[PDB]
Amino acid sequence: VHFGHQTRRWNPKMKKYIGIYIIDLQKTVKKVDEANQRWLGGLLTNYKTISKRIKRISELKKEYDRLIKFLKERNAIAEARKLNVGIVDTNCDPDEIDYVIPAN
Amino acid sequence: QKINPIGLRVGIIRDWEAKWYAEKDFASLLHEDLKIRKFIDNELKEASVSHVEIERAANRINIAIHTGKPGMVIGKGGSEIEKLRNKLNALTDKKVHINVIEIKKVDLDARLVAENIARQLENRASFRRVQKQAITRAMKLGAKGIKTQVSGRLGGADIARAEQYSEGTVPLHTLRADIDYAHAEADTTYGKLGVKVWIYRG
Amino acid sequence: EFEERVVTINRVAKVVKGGRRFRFTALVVVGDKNGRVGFGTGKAQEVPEAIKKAVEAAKKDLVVVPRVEGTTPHTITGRYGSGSVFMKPAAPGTGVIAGGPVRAVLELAGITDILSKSLGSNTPINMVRATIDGLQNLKNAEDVAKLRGKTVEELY
RNA sequence: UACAA
RNA sequence: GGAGGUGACACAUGAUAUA
RNA sequence: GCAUGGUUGUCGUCAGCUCGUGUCGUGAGAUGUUGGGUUAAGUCCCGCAACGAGCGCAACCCUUAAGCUUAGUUGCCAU
RNA sequence: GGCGACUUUCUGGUCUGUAACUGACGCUGAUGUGCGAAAGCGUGGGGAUCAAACAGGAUUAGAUACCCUGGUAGUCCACGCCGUAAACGAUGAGUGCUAAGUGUUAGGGGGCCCCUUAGUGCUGCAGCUAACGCAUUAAGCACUCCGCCUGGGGAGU
RNA sequence: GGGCGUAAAGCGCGCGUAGGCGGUUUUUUAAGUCUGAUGUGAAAGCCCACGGCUCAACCGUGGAGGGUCAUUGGAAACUGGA
Numbered sequence: 001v002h003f004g005h006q007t008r009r010w011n012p013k014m015k016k017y018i019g020i021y022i023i024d025l026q027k028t029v030k031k032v033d034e035a036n037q038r039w040l041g042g043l044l045t046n047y048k049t050i051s052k053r054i055k056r057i058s059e060l061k062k063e064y065d066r067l068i069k070f071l072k073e074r075n076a077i078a079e080a081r082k083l084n085v086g087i088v089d090t091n092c093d094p095d096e097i098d099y100v101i102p103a104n
Numbered sequence: 105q106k107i108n109p110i111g112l113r114v115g116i117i118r119d120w121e122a123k124w125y126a127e128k129d130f131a132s133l134l135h136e137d138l139k140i141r142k143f144i145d146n147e148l149k150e151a152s153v154s155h156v157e158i159e160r161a162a163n164r165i166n167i168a169i170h171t172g173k174p175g176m177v178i179g180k181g182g183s184e185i186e187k188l189r190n191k192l193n194a195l196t197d198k199k200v201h202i203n204v205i206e207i208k209k210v211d212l213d214a215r216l217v218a219e220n221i222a223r224q225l226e227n228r229a230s231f232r233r234v235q236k237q238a239i240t241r242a243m244k245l246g247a248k249g250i251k252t253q254v255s256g257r258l259g260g261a262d263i264a265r266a267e268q269y270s271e272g273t274v275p276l277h278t279l280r281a282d283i284d285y286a287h288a289e290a291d292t293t294y295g296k297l298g299v300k301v302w303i304y305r306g
Numbered sequence: 307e308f309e310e311r312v313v314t315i316n317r318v319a320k321v322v323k324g325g326r327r328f329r330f331t332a333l334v335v336v337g338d339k340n341g342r343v344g345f346g347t348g349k350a351q352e353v354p355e356a357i358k359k360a361v362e363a364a365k366k367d368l369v370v371v372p373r374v375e376g377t378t379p380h381t382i383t384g385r386y387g388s389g390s391v392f393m394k395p396a397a398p399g400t401g402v403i404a405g406g407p408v409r410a411v412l413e414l415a416g417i418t419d420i421l422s423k424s425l426g427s428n429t430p431i432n433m434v435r436a437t438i439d440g441l442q443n444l445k446n447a448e449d450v451a452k453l454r455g456k457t458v459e460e461l462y
Numbered sequence: 463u464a465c466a467a
Numbered sequence: 468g469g470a471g472g473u474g475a476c477a478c479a480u481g482a483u484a485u486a
Numbered sequence: 487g488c489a490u491g492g493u494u495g496u497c498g499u500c501a502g503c504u505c506g507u508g509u510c511g512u513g514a515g516a517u518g519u520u521g522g523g524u525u526a527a528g529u530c531c532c533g534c535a536a537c538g539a540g541c542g543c544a545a546c547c548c549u550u551a552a553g554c555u556u557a558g559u560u561g562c563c564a565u
Numbered sequence: 566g567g568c569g570a571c572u573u574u575c576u577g578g579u580c581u582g583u584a585a586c587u588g589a590c591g592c593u594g595a596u597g598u599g600c601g602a603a604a605g606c607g608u609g610g611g612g613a614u615c616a617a618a619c620a621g622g623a624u625u626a627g628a629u630a631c632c633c634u635g636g637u638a639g640u641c642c643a644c645g646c647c648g649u650a651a652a653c654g655a656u657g658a659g660u661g662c663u664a665a666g667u668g669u670u671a672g673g674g675g676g677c678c679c680c681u682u683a684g685u686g687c688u689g690c691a692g693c694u695a696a697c698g699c700a701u702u703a704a705g706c707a708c709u710c711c712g713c714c715u716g717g718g719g720a721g722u
Numbered sequence: 723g724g725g726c727g728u729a730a731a732g733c734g735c736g737c738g739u740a741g742g743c744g745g746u747u748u749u750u751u752a753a754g755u756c757u758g759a760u761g762u763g764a765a766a767g768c769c770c771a772c773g774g775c776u777c778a779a780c781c782g783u784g785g786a787g788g789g790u791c792a793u794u795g796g797a798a799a800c801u802g803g804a
């Protein structure tokens with residue numbers, strides 16, 4: 001859980017956390033103490049609308065089959081980073097993680 | 105362009121307002137009916153009358169009046185409905201029996217909402233504000249949808265136009281949907297203003 | 307609570323296969339006159355509906371404006387794009403010497419005494435954004451004393 | 463629409 | 468997938484503002 | 487009818503046209519509504535900063551093509 | 566500006582490494598002085614191809630064009646002149662500083678890879694921008710010097 | 723207290739004169755720079771204060787200001803000179 005992505009794509013901000021690059025296992029352990037489907041656009045920023053679908057899911061079969069299945073993560077961070085913890089590989093941006101775990 | 109929502113549904117999911125049968129006196133009875141409907145509109149113009157139903161049988165005319173304000177039609181002690189019944193028996197020379205049916209929630213009745221808007225427009229009220237208030241009231245009372253439209257020289261403009269508002273669903277192509285519709289006219293200093301209201305209850 | 311002021315109402319158009327489709331853009335500044343100001347925009351076919359959207363959006367980006375006895379701590383120029391607003395502390399007797407949308411932003415912030423000049427684009431949205439930029443970069447003496455590791459007296 | 467031809 | 472290089476019969480016209 | 491209400495024709499039964507919230511953009515705007523297939527159809531599925539909704543499509547209405555029950559006159563006629 | 570068969574002769578500049586040497590001898594540069602595609606001009610040669618002009622044939626309402634058949638200057642050489650181009654990266658020169666990734670040209674160092682110079686491309690942060698975009702080959706951050714701009718037309722008259 | 727990729731604006735490009743600008747340190751100087759002294763910058767005016775006009779204009783009185791000024795004594799970091 002400490003072998004990151006290839007060198008030809010490693011973000012420069014993971015140099016402290018980092019052939020291929022190997023993660024900082026020693027630093028992740030100290031960081032770990034400090035700390036499945038598509039993410040709908042506006043899951044957090046549009047709860048005034050999603051909750052209606054969440055409520056309508058609780059309350060047709062064609063909708064529910066996709067609704068149950070529903071209710072890489074750049075959409076989610078913006079929904080949270082704009083509101084003012086997560087595994088952060090070398091290719092991922094660390095500057096936008098409050099509790100970054102530098103483990104693969 | 106758009107068919108009258110009532111006329112499309114008459115005899116399908118909406119009932120006739122005239123319930124009688126005739127063959128050779130059809131024209132004479134039809135125009136006695138229209139004579140009565142014009143009389144009631146004029147004589148009860150302030151009594152919030154939504155619609156009038158006429159039934160005929162055995163030289164008797166049974167008239168049902170659906171009114172928002174039934175106490176004005178009946179009058180204190182039944183005196184106002186006795187006076188109207190006496191005048192109807194003179195326009196007709198038949199035995200008229202009048203029934204009055206209160207319509208609660210006058211804000212869900214297209215005819216009453218349309219005429220209220222027309223009355224406010226004649227008082228120089230904002231053609232936008234009256235439409236938005238009527239829509240908010242109907243939707244608060246559980247209307248599935250409502251549409252309003254005022255057409256003409258809005259605010260005394262030299263060029264007439266139509267401003268319409270809507271809320272909810274008003275499925276004018278769905279035949280089984282009971283859509284209440286009414287048109288009313290406001291007499292302003294600048295001419296005719298047309299008010300159309302569509303209400304969908306569910 | 308928050309007072310709001312309608313800075314500018316603009317009717318905008320987009321062209322379609324028919325004629326033109328019109329909407330209304332409202333630029334609104336909100337503020338409490340106690341050091342918190344914010345601006346927002348909203349668009350609608352109706353002017354009042356665009357104002358409410360603009361008011362609601364303004365509340366999400368309130369800014370904290372440092373003040374000293376009703377005036378700014380130092381001179382600053384706020385710049386956003388082509389907009390640029392020069393703001394200077396003035397004596398308590400002086401009023402808000404500002405021209406347009408700057409006056410709305412500074413008043414709703416609670417300034418009442420400032421010397422400001424708009425040096426740049428007079429487009430209201432960018433003038434407003436420039437004004438907020440300059441207020442966003444003001445620093446009070448207690449804050450800069452903390453970063454430099456001295457006390458406030460040693461700053462002078 | 464008011465014009466022009 | 469997106470760029471940069473490379474190569475690849477005939478059909479005239481429609482006054483001014485206001486839109 | 488170039489001051490209007492109401493009513494109608496036409497593009498044209500063309501499948502499109504929008505809105506709310508969110509998000510992107512200084513902004514006009516955009517997105518959704520595009521993309522891969524599919525359909526008479528913005529019809530449907532999948533993917534997607536969109537999620538939903540509305541007016542449209544369709545379906546609910548009339549009639550025509552088959553059968554059954556009720557009914558047998560003024561309809562029908564096999565014994 | 567430009568430069569493309571090969572050979573010889575004459576000759577300019579750049580790059581890498583080294584750290585012998587000199588010891589700020591540098592940068593920029595008004596005026597000035599030179600070089601400067603193509604067309605063009607003069608003198609004299611040359612003349613295959615192509616081809617302004619021009620001729621004929623088509624097309625067309627007309628066709629002083631586009632298309633076809635020819636064809637002169639010119640296109641080529643030498644020596645003079647001319648001094649202009651979207652002469653463009655539409656980006657003046659010098660110096661330093663500021664994430665990365667990935668091709669390619671000429672080298673160097675070390676163990677095909679790693680490091681490093683100098684060019685030449687693409688992508689892409691911070692920053693900048695009106696946006697488009699630029700982004701260690703800046704349009705970023707700075708200092709020095711030069712050239713230039715101040716609404717459009719009139720008029721580069 | 724602005725600009726020059728596409729809005730007006732980088733000379734087509736070299737070489738180079740005057741000029742402008744110029745790496746590190748030590749000593750020295752004192753032209754620039756800084757800091758006092760003296761003289762002068764008339765009066766009226768402007769600004770502040772006070773007084774006379776019934777108030778005010780206005781008038782008067784006392785200050786302040788205005789030099790890239792000169793002469794003279796100090797300082798030596800920076801620019802200049804050795």
Ligand SMILES: [Mg+2]
Binds near residue numbers: 544
């Ligand atoms: Mg249908």
Ligand SMILES: [Mg+2]
Binds near residue numbers: 580
């Ligand atoms: Mg070389």
Ligand SMILES: [Mg+2]
Binds near residue numbers: 593
């Ligand atoms: Mg030079």
Ligand SMILES: [Mg+2]
């Ligand atoms: Mg020159």
Ligand SMILES: [Mg+2]
């Ligand atoms: Mg030539």
Ligand SMILES: [Mg+2]
């Ligand atoms: Mg030819």
Ligand SMILES: [Mg+2]
């Ligand atoms: Mg020749």
Ligand SMILES: [Mg+2]
């Ligand atoms: Mg020659």
Ligand SMILES: [Mg+2]
């Ligand atoms: Mg140029």
Ligand SMILES: [Mg+2]
């Ligand atoms: Mg430069």
Ligand SMILES: [Mg+2]
């Ligand atoms: Mg540089």
Ligand SMILES: [Mg+2]
Binds near residue numbers: 689700
């Ligand atoms: Mg780039």
Ligand SMILES: [Mg+2]
């Ligand atoms: Mg390079």
Ligand SMILES: [Mg+2]
Binds near residue numbers: 724
């Ligand atoms: Mg300018």
Ligand SMILES: [Mg+2]
């Ligand atoms: Mg420049």
Ligand SMILES: [Mg+2]
């Ligand atoms: Mg141009």
